[PDB]
């Protein structure tokens, strides 16, 4: 979610630059996240609803890694890299 933070930041800078900016401009510069955020919502929602346990979250995100939205795919891929971090880590002691 960090790039959303940075996007809003750059918006405030440009609004400091110009004192009369339509809402449509904000709509544009933020319209790329308008699609990514709903996609990630179901990823969290299934975990909450199904009480998904342990590594099964890894599968849960992997099955949505086949999303037909390239930005959503890359975004979720980052998360799976992070969680593969911990899985590899627990495997790094027992093995």
């Amino acid at each position: 979610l960090q790039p959303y933070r940075q996007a809003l930041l750059d918006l405030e800078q440009e609004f400091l630059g110009d004192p009369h900016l339509s809402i449509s401009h904000v709509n544009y510069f933020l319209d790329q996240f308008q699609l990514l955020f709903p996609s990630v919502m179901v990823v969290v929602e299934q975990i909450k609803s199904q009480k998904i346990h342990g590594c099964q979250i890894l599968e849960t995100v992997y099955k949505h890694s086949c999303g037909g939205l390239p930005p959503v795919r890359s975004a979720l891929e980052k998360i799976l890299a992070v969680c593969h971090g911990v899985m590899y880590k627990q495997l790094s002691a027992w093995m």
Partner: protein, 83 residues
């Protein structure tokens, strides 16, 4: 036993750093390491703690491979075991 612990830690580290999961290189590292350990493990048991002798003793005693000793034991302790 050999301290390739650090080396495989480095390997697994690079595997962390890779962005997208590659089953092939994961399989490679676990197997190659599983050859430096899971396979080299075999040589360690069979050589460091020789299993040939252990199996020999097992057959010699569990399976009456020591005929003279077991026959003599029967002969000497006949009455005690009989009671």
């Amino acid at each position: 036993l050999k301290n390739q612990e650090d080396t495989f830690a480095a390997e697994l580290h690079r595997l962390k750093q890779q962005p997208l999961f590659s089953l092939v290189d994961f399989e490679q590292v676990v197997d190659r390491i599983r050859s430096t350990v899971a396979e080299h493990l075999w040589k360690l048991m069979v050589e460091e703690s020789d299993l040939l002798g252990q199996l020999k003793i097992i057959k010699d005693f569990y399976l009456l491979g020591r005929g003279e000793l077991f026959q003599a034991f029967i002969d000497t302790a006949q009455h005690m075991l009989k009671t």
